[PDB]
Amino acid sequence: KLVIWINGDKGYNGLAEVGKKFEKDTGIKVTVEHPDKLEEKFPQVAATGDGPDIIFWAHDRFGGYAQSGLLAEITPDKAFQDKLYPFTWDAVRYNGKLIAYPIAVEALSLIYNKDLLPNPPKTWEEIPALDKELKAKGKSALMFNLQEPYFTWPLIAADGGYAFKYENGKYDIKDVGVDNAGAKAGLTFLVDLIKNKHMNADTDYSIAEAAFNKGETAMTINGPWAWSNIDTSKVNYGVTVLPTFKGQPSKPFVGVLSAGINAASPNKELAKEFLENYLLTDEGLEAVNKDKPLGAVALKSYEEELAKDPRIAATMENAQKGEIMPNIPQMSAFWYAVRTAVINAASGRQTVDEALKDAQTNSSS
Ligand SMILES: OC[C@H]1O[C@H](O[C@H]2[C@H](O)[C@@H](O)[C@@H](O[C@H]3[C@H](O)[C@@H](O)[C@@H](O)O[C@@H]3CO)O[C@@H]2CO)[C@H](O)[C@@H](O)[C@@H]1O
Numbered sequence: 001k002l003v004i005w006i007n008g009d010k011g012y013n014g015l016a017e018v019g020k021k022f023e024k025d026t027g028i029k030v031t032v033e034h035p036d037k038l039e040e041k042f043p044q045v046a047a048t049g050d051g052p053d054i055i056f057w058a059h060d061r062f063g064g065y066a067q068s069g070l071l072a073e074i075t076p077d078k079a080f081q082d083k084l085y086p087f088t089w090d091a092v093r094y095n096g097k098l099i100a101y102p103i104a105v106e107a108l109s110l111i112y113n114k115d116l117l118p119n120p121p122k123t124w125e126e127i128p129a130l131d132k133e134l135k136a137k138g139k140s141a142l143m144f145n146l147q148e149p150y151f152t153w154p155l156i157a158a159d160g161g162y163a164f165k166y167e168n169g170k171y172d173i174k175d176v177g178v179d180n181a182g183a184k185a186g187l188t189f190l191v192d193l194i195k196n197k198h199m200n201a202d203t204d205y206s207i208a209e210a211a212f213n214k215g216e217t218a219m220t221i222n223g224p225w226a227w228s229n230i231d232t233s234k235v236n237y238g239v240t241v242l243p244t245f246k247g248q249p250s251k252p253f254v255g256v257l258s259a260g261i262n263a264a265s266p267n268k269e270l271a272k273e274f275l276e277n278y279l280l281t282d283e284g285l286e287a288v289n290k291d292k293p294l295g296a297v298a299l300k301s302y303e304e305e306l307a308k309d310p311r312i313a314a315t316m317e318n319a320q321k322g323e324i325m326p327n328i329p330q331m332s333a334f335w336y337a338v339r340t341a342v343i344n345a346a347s348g349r350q351t352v353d354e355a356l357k358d359a360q361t362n363s364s365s
Contacts, residue, residue: 014291058255
């Protein structure tokens with residue numbers, strides 16, 4: 001009776017273990033699913049009053065579901081809210097109402113093979129040279145998901161790109177920073193790495209992951225969820241600050257994996273009890289984190305154990321160098337516009353200037 005959607009890159013088996021712990025106490029079975037594009041499927045099935053009871057995604061998507069009336073306002077009392085970091089409640093704050101439970105805070109870091117690269121580059125600019133050392137050996141410096149703007153954004157933003165100008169605890173949807181000087185420098189650098197054969201326009205999550213995990217590439221760009229598979233692989237890896245660009249620190253967009261309750265769910269009390277009293281506990285999170293690391297968890301008591309982990313220290317350091325995603329409805333437009341921008345600039349279909357121009361138009365209008 002309890003159906004959960006969570007993306008395929010997350011700890012869905014650990015989450016089902018927490019769902020067994022629930023069935024044990026309530027008699028209610030939990031069905032964890034990981035459909036493709038589920039963030040895209042949700043507004044379509046919830047808009048007809050359909051979908052899962054609970055949906056897990058980064059908080060960025062949630063402003064849009066909320067103002068469309070697809071998410072239940074959640075009702076944690078103040079004692080429960082005191083359990084979690086204040087900024088993680090900020091992330092799910094839409095129009096002044098809490099619209100999801102925050103689970104974990106995610107930032108991309110640089111992941112490097114210590115065997116091939118004992119001292120990883122401090123800069124983007126030294127990557128070309130390193131690539132030339134590695135190639136001679138049949139290996140490459142760096143492979144990461146080029147298809148999703150999330151992975152390329154840290155670089156576009158370094159020298160001054162931004163999504164929506166942040167004013168007073170607010171956001172201006174007419175002021176988009178996707179087509180400024182810093183955005184152009186950033187995307188030009190990425191396009192120049194592809195042009196000079198240091199990376200390939202067609203590299204995706206799976207391709208990049210298999211290459212790093214097999215030891216074919218010295219580095220990758222990835223988040224906490226990815227470290228379990230690296231642990232299984234026998235690559236000896238470090239988790240560090242992203243390269244700087246033009247002497248500036250890469251600025252990843254920071255996501256707070258969050259759990260929304262479908263407004264059409266006839267099981268809202270069950271969903272509440274599951275999220276508060278099973279998932280968001282030291283035991284629940286550890287069942288999930290054990291499956292695929294979550295990053296810096298929202299739950300203070302569990303985060304203090306995780307915080308000592310140097311991979312977590314470097315995750316939080318990249319997070320502090322980047323920006324919390326907006327949750328406003330306009331984010332999916334912003335993301336679709338930067339997706340096409342980067343794809344088209346990588347492939348040659350548009351120059352950097354004309355790609356970022358059209359993204360600016362599509363992000364803001
Ligand atoms: O590019 C098209 C794509 O854009 C939007 O997706 C963005 C996500 O909503 C945003 O959270 C972020 O997603 C990353 C996850 O948060 C992270 O946990 C991990 O799973 O990697 C994701 C990157 O794949 O970034 C993407 C931007 O790439 C929009 O919501 C999507 O529906 C749309 O298909």
